[PDB]
Amino acid sequence: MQGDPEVIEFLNEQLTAELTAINQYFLHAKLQDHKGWTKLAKYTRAESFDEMRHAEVLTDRILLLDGLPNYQRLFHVRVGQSVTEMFQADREVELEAIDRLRRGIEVMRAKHDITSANVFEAILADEEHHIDYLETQLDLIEKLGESLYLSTVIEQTQ
Amino acid sequence: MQGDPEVIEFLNEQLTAELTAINQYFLHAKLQDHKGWTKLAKYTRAESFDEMRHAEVLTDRILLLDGLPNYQRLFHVRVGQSVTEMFQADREVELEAIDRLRRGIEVMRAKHDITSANVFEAILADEEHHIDYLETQLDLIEKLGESLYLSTVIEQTQ
Amino acid sequence: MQGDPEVIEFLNEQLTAELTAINQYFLHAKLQDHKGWTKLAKYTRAESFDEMRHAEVLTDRILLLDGLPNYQRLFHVRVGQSVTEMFQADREVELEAIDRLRRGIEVMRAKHDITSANVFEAILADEEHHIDYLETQLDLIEKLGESLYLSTVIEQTQ
Amino acid sequence: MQGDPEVIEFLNEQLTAELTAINQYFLHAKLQDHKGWTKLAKYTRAESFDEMRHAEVLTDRILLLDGLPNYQRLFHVRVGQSVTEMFQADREVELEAIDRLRRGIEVMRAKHDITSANVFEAILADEEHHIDYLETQLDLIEKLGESLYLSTVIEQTQ
Amino acid sequence: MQGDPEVIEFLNEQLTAELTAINQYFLHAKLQDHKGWTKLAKYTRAESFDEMRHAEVLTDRILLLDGLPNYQRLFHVRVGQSVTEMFQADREVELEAIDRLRRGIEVMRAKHDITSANVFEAILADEEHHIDYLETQLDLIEKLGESLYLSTVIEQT
Amino acid sequence: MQGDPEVIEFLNEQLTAELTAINQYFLHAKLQDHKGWTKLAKYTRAESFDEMRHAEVLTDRILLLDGLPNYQRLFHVRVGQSVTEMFQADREVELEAIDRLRRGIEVMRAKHDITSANVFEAILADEEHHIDYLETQLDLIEKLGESLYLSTVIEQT
Amino acid sequence: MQGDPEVIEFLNEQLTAELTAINQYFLHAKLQDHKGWTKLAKYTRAESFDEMRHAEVLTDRILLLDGLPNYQRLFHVRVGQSVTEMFQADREVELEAIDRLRRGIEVMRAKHDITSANVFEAILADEEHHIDYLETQLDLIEKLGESLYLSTVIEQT
Ligand code: HEM
Ligand code: HEM
Ligand SMILES: [Fe+2]
Ligand SMILES: [Fe+2]
Ligand SMILES: [Fe+2]
Ligand SMILES: [Fe+2]
Ligand SMILES: [Fe+2]
Ligand SMILES: [Fe+2]
Numbered sequence A, B, C, D: 001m002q003g004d005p006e007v008i009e010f011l012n013e014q015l016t017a018e019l020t021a022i023n024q025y026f027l028h029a030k031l032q033d034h035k036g037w038t039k040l041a042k043y044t045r046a047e048s049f050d051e052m053r054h055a056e057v058l059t060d061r062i063l064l065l066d067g068l069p070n071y072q073r074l075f076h077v078r079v080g081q082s083v084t085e086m087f088q089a090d091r092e093v094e095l096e097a098i099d100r101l102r103r104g105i106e107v108m109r110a111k112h113d114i115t116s117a118n119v120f121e122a123i124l125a126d127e128e129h130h131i132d133y134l135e136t137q138l139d140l141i142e143k144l145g146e147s148l149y150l151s152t153v154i155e156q157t158q
Numbered sequence E, F, G: 001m002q003g004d005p006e007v008i009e010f011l012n013e014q015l016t017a018e019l020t021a022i023n024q025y026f027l028h029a030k031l032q033d034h035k036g037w038t039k040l041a042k043y044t045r046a047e048s049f050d051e052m053r054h055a056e057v058l059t060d061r062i063l064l065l066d067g068l069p070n071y072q073r074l075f076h077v078r079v080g081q082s083v084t085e086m087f088q089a090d091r092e093v094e095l096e097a098i099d100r101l102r103r104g105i106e107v108m109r110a111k112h113d114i115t116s117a118n119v120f121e122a123i124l125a126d127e128e129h130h131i132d133y134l135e136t137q138l139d140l141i142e143k144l145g146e147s148l149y150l151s152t153v154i155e156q157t
């Protein structure tokens, strides 16, 4: 089996995006933990682990088609200072990923490669779920305010 | 609910292929067991059982569309003498099945029958996995050699 | 050890008969299940599994004598629409098998090969039991009738 | 009940063969153990115990017919130095036993003594199984070679 | 499937013999129990139950061949007063059964009916075992004597 | 390490004696079982198994010294009809074994081979125990008589 | 109780040999472990522990006789680089120990001191077992070869 170079190009681009997202999410979780926002940090850490799982699946698919995974290239990592900025950066990443996923799914399904299309379909569903969560949190912050919102995620906790 | 004749023709052809594969894999497993190659025999027996399950699923799908399953056909069965020959025969069977599966999925999805397309998609994923395994084993035999490779799959008994 | 070609011919013929019976019984069980006759379907499925066991024993015996098992040849498979027709087809298959078994047992025991004769003896006992069951069911259907008999093997759900 | 002298002669000859086989197998197992070949030694010890059981059954049958079991005879015992020689000696013993068993079964069944014939039939089946094992091991040694074959049965522990 | 009338005749004869043996063994066990010979009665009861099982197997085989089992005919039942006499009667029954079994096995196997031959083979093995036991007990009684032998099978309860 | 040929000769002679004893004891146990003497048969089986254990130890010792064990020759096997005769045959075997063991122990210990001497010492102790048992049983049979003695080792089961 | 000077001299010499063997075996086990040969290392470590136990027993016996154990001596320690060399060094040590043990046992038993003789007898049996193992391993290496033999004792974990 030897896949088309275009399919492998799409998969490698998605892999680079996954690695960038992993780095950004872990850094954000550590930064949030340093400030005393424990409950946010737990959620962000879980999201980073999910990003790893996506990256592993993509790597396995690329290896099965007799390609060379790219572990050297990275995109630009966004770091925010307040919580609104972190949420906005995550939203940007998710939107880019969703657009790429849709275009790649169409292209792959046009050339009789169904398994890669199914992989991108699952990843797309997960990305949509995460973006919905991010938008809900941004709305909550907009309504309550930053201080009253942050008052609900701090624990003395030994 | 009455399916198109072409969809039923595709499904019956896949069923005939499944039955042929079941027979060939079971015979190969028995032959390997008779020679003292135990782990290979176990793996081949498991593969034959998986083929049996695939045949059952195909039969159910054909019956739901008010068709007549064909249990009288059979394609040519290939029997080898050394390990390399068995692996090569299995590879040939898998390649034929994968080509047929892709063409059938396209045709079925062009006529608004989605469930049959999903069935073929799952079968295609399984076939790709098995072909990958076969190619890996052929590479290992090429590198190590037949005697040193066979020395790793022989056991005494109790 | 190298058995006589006639003994191997007998064993291979019995193996072909076993494979044909396996296919016919499985197809009949699936057809019965599709109509709602669950209790008949369970029994037919069990019979198909027993036919597998017989085929495996025959294959092992053939391999021990340094022969080539035949997995390419099939006889004619009979399919019926009613239940009486299915029972009649099964009866025909059983009668043929019993006749072949008796002749083969005599021939094998005339040439000092006892293990093969014992194998055929066990298979013959099993076939006689199954034919007795089939005749009893046909008598019950004759006495009661199709509708009243079928009313006793239909179950709503689980 | 008093059996025919010829039946008792056959049974006593088989008993002498059993005793000789027991002695040879135990000596071979001890010799293999002294050299560091552990799994071979275990298998040979199990075979010796099986021959012990066969001798016991033969003794019981002889006693039930009001005869005198012979515990003073012994055939020539063969001892090898390499693995091939041991396997060849075992093969010779098995071939002799099988020939005697077939002739004895025919003679016994010609004179209306059925239980003795059944005893010989069971012993014959066991002997055929063992000879098949021996031939398989000889083929494996021929294919791999003595050094690579022996590398798979050595283990130093406690 | 319809068997030959001769095979069915053999099987029905062997069934009549089994019924006679069942009756004789149960009566002997009850008689032994009445006298206080506690340990003999258990063995005799077990033998009677084994005969019952043999009769059931024979009945099943006869029914499978589309025949009519005979439950009306009996042979002569022998009753002994001493223990030696009981053992001797049992020995006679066993010898008759063994002879009939061998002849029937030969005839059945000459006509391509193998399952019936196997049934008779199993029954023959069992009969040989029982006759061996009976002969051993007769030898023990001969060596020891009635009183010393009987002193070993009585119990207070 | 290579032992002296004389030590190996002694060990091989003891091995031949062990094999002969194994055969004789097993045959006697089977014969006793066929007659209905269950409790004697159990003891005889146990003795035969002990004789095998002795044979295995001797074989291991011979192999460690780079010798060739002899599994081809046997002595004369004694078979008796009564129980007194069986006991007498066993006594003869034991006496021969004990004499050989003492002479071999002295010779082995005279040449600086201690492990073989210890092996023979253990075997000698076991043989003395068995001979004591045999003599006790012969005395009991002499005092009671054969019938009254045999009446104590029979069961129905 | 005061033992003879010669008995104590023999015991102290055996103690020095034991200490030397302990050091050599532990060093060999560590060296084998550093190279990736795991099962050999385990076996050698067990052997070193056994030597430790032997040294303890010898020390106890020497103290019971009102003597002074020597913990300052040491014989030459042999270190190899390949497996064959290690096995050969161990064989040399074992042969020396066995010769000394036999001579000491004779001398001790000539002067009516039996417990020390029994101690040396047990140690001698153990030494013979170990030397047999070493010779078997050397034969296996000779037959298979160095690489194919080492391929069976390497584990990755
Ligand atoms: C066209 C021929 C055959 C068909 C359509 C067929 C079909 C099936 C199916 C669908 C099952 C379901 C088992 C499950 O649900 O786990 C089954 C059971 C089984 N069949 Fe077959 N089979 C065929 C030939 C054979 C042959 C030739 C053998 C033996 C040489 C065999 C051995 C078995 C075994 C062992 C099982 C049960 C596995 C287990 O319980 O571990 N089959 N069969
Ligand atoms: C070193 C040689 C032998 C070994 C290791 C050995 C080992 C054994 C063992 C462990 C048992 C079962 C123990 C028990 O259940 O009491 C047994 C049973 C038996 N052995 Fe041996 N034995 C040896 C020698 C022999 C010889 C030389 C013969 C015949 C000449 C023999 C004939 C038998 C028989 C017939 C049985 C069945 C015992 C029974 O069912 O009562 N054995 N053997
Ligand atoms: Fe992702
Ligand atoms: Fe398949
Ligand atoms: Fe069948
Ligand atoms: Fe045997
Ligand atoms: Fe009966
Ligand atoms: Fe002994």
Ligand SMILES: [Fe+2]
Binding pocket: G018, G021, G050, G051, G054, G123
């Ligand atoms: Fe030591």
Ligand SMILES: [Fe+3]
Binding pocket: B094, B126, B127, B130
């Ligand atoms: Fe496949």
Ligand SMILES: [Fe+3]
Binding pocket: C094, C126, C127, C130
């Ligand atoms: Fe059937």
Ligand SMILES: [Fe+3]
Binding pocket: D094, D126, D127, D130
């Ligand atoms: Fe054998």
Ligand SMILES: [Fe+3]
Binding pocket: E021, E094, E126, E127, E130
């Ligand atoms: Fe009876």
Ligand SMILES: [Fe+3]
Binding pocket: F094, F126, F127, F130
């Ligand atoms: Fe003894």
Ligand SMILES: [Fe+3]
Binding pocket: G094, G126, G127, G130
């Ligand atoms: Fe040591």
